[PDB]
Each structure stands twice: as C-alpha cells, then as structure tokens.
Amino acid sequence: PVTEAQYVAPTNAVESKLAEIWERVLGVSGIGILDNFFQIGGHALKAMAVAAQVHREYQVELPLKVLFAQPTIKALAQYVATRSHHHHHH
Numbered sequence: 001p002v003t004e005a006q007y008v009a010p011t012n013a014v015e016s017k018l019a020e021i022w023e024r025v026l027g028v029s030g031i032g033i034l035d036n037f038f039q040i041g042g043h044a045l046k047a048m049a050v051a052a053q054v055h056r057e058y059q060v061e062l063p064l065k066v067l068f069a070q071p072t073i074k075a076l077a078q079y080v081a082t083r084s085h086h087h088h089h090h
Helices: 013-026 044-058 064-069 073-084
Strands: none
Touching: 013 044, 013 073, 044 064, 044 073, 064 073
C-alpha cells in the first residue's frame, strides 16, 4: 500500500539499465521506477529470468526474496548499487 504514483521514467543510469532489461523480459515498453513488476504482467518465472541476465551483467546475485519483496526498478537499482559498490571483505 505505497505504489500509488503515476509512471515515472528512470533518471539514474542504474535504474535506466534495469528498466531496459525489464522491457526485454516482459516484451513491453515504459518501465518506470515505481512500476510493480507483477502489475505489468511479470510473474515468478519471469522474475527469476531477470536475475539470470542481471547476475551476469551486474556480477550480483538477486534472490527471489528481493524481487518479490521489492518488485520495482527503484528497489533493484538500490539493492544492486549497494552490492556493486567496493566492499572490503579483506
């Protein structure tokens, strides 16, 4: 009960790349930062397919637990961004 905004195109490059990837998986155009993946027509099978190309592209694991909990470009962009950053596992 918070995804009530109108379509808003991605404005940060990360968001912009994920929105493109969604268009290639869903076969539609106009993916926004607030577009709820499941509302667009996507489902679990599609969600797992997103993580497949993204894991190889962004070098990062995306479990369904994140995709389903936060089915939005904004969420994935931040979840991915914080992981792509320079960690210090040492």
